[PDB]
Nucleic acid binder design. Structure first.
Length: 65
RNA sequence: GUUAAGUUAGAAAGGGCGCACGGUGGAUGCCUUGGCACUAGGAGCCGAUGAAGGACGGGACGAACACCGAUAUGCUUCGGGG
């Protein structure tokens, strides 16, 4: 997901995908607290994909300053 | 046959000793998951660019340890490694 997201433009191509995965993380715990979910390791992998995205823009702010 | 005097062994409610067989127990014997002692070399300070210490928290899995801060049981990228 590195060159997939390094090549993405700074403004919304991370940010809307940040916001969608925030909404995606918002939905998966609802299935799990009810118990109506199976692939629980994806939920770990979603936040694993979240934290690697917020550090992209923060790295690019260092590239700015 | 009995009468008389007369000796004279046995027993065990339970215990004493000798062996036999168990139980509690944790000593010894052996080992090491850590110690102390130094020698040799290296390092001898970190902080208002927020310390040391923490407290509170983070997993599909329950609390505690260890790891780690709402980017939370790693994250990117640089090498190693298969």
């Amino acid at each position: 997901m590195k060159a997939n997201e390094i090549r993405d433009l700074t403004t919304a191509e991370i940010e809307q995908k940040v916001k969608s995965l925030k909404e995606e993380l918002f939905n998966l715990r609802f299935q799990l607290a009810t118990g109506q979910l199976e692939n629980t390791a994806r939920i770990r992998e979603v936040r694993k994909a979240i934290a690697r995205m917020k550090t992209v823009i923060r790295e690019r702010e260092i590239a700015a300053n």
